[PDB]
Write an enzyme that holds these catalytic residues in place. Structure first.
Site, PDB file in Angstrom:
ATOM      1  N   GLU A 216      42.261  43.282  -2.531  1.00 55.76           N
ATOM      2  CA  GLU A 216      41.381  43.363  -1.360  1.00 55.76           C
ATOM      3  C   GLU A 216      41.259  44.803  -0.843  1.00 55.76           C
ATOM      4  O   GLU A 216      40.148  45.272  -0.640  1.00 55.76           O
ATOM      5  CB  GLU A 216      41.862  42.436  -0.237  1.00 55.76           C
ATOM      6  CG  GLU A 216      41.650  40.947  -0.497  1.00 55.76           C
ATOM      7  CD  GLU A 216      40.197  40.523  -0.626  1.00 55.76           C
ATOM      8  OE1 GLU A 216      39.291  41.326  -0.342  1.00 55.76           O
ATOM      9  OE2 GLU A 216      39.962  39.360  -0.995  1.00 55.76           O
TER      10      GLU A 216
ATOM     11  N   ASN B 230      29.888  43.212   3.776  1.00 57.56           N
ATOM     12  CA  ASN B 230      29.548  42.048   2.972  1.00 57.56           C
ATOM     13  C   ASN B 230      28.031  42.040   2.883  1.00 57.56           C
ATOM     14  O   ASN B 230      27.393  42.743   3.625  1.00 57.56           O
ATOM     15  CB  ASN B 230      30.108  40.796   3.631  1.00 57.56           C
ATOM     16  CG  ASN B 230      31.611  40.885   3.850  1.00 57.56           C
ATOM     17  OD1 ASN B 230      32.345  41.222   2.932  1.00 57.56           O
ATOM     18  ND2 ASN B 230      32.067  40.604   5.074  1.00 57.56           N
TER      19      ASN B 230
ATOM     20  N   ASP C   3      26.017  39.710   3.804  1.00 57.14           N
ATOM     21  CA  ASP C   3      25.453  39.137   5.059  1.00 57.14           C
ATOM     22  C   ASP C   3      25.475  40.025   6.318  1.00 57.14           C
ATOM     23  O   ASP C   3      25.099  39.550   7.395  1.00 57.14           O
ATOM     24  CB  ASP C   3      26.124  37.788   5.384  1.00 57.14           C
ATOM     25  CG  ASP C   3      27.499  37.941   5.956  1.00 57.14           C
ATOM     26  OD1 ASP C   3      28.221  38.877   5.573  1.00 57.14           O
ATOM     27  OD2 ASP C   3      27.862  37.119   6.801  1.00 57.14           O
TER      28      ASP C   3
ATOM     29  N   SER D 187      28.203  41.186   7.845  1.00 58.86           N
ATOM     30  CA  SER D 187      29.548  41.194   8.392  1.00 58.86           C
ATOM     31  C   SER D 187      30.362  42.268   7.630  1.00 58.86           C
ATOM     32  O   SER D 187      29.917  42.781   6.587  1.00 58.86           O
ATOM     33  CB  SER D 187      30.171  39.797   8.313  1.00 58.86           C
ATOM     34  OG  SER D 187      30.181  39.321   6.991  1.00 58.86           O
TER      35      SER D 187
ATOM     36  N   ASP E 165      34.462  43.473   6.269  1.00 57.78           N
ATOM     37  CA  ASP E 165      35.836  43.082   5.972  1.00 57.78           C
ATOM     38  C   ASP E 165      36.788  44.158   6.480  1.00 57.78           C
ATOM     39  O   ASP E 165      36.557  45.328   6.238  1.00 57.78           O
ATOM     40  CB  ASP E 165      36.042  42.918   4.461  1.00 57.78           C
ATOM     41  CG  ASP E 165      35.432  41.629   3.890  1.00 57.78           C
ATOM     42  OD1 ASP E 165      34.803  40.857   4.626  1.00 57.78           O
ATOM     43  OD2 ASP E 165      35.589  41.383   2.668  1.00 57.78           O
TER      44      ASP E 165
END
EC number: 3.2.1.17
Length: 129
Positions: free
Chosen positions: A35, A46, A48, A50, A52
């Protein structure tokens, strides 16, 4: 902060993740590796809109507020920048809500694609725990 594999392991066990919801310590380390590369300051966008955040790439669509994710929730009641601290407490505590949500660690796409069904033990190999 950039952790060593075993340090991160140590801290994750300390914070209550070893076999948390059945998921041994190697799963969380492997997930952290893929990650963020163990780096607490890791951010990524991301598709969309958003973002991380953190050592486990916890996302603003559901779990935190970053002030720029329209139509999102803040299920861990935190600002997303709390997830970038050298102290992983917030990330772990939030991971536990995510992981306890029905889908288990599959919530982390990097876990299911890169860690799941693999020898996750190796991620804690040679560490004092």
């Amino acid at each position: 902060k950039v952790f060593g594999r075993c340090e991160l392991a140590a801290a994750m066990k300390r914070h209550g993740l070893d076999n948390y919801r059945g998921y041994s310590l190697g799963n969380w380390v492997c997930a952290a590796k893929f990650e963020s590369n163990f780096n607490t300051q890791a951010t990524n966008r991301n598709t969309d809109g958003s973002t991380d955040y953190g050592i486990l790439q916890i996302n603003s669509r559901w779990w935190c507020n970053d002030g720029r994710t329209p139509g999102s929730r803040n299920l861990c009641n935190i600002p997303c920048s709390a997830l970038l601290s050298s102290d992983i407490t917030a990330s772990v505590n939030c991971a536990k809500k995510i992981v306890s949500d029905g889908n288990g660690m599959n919530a982390w796409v990097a876990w299911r694609n890169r860690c799941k069904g693999t020898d996750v033990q190796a991620w804690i190999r040679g560490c004092r725990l």
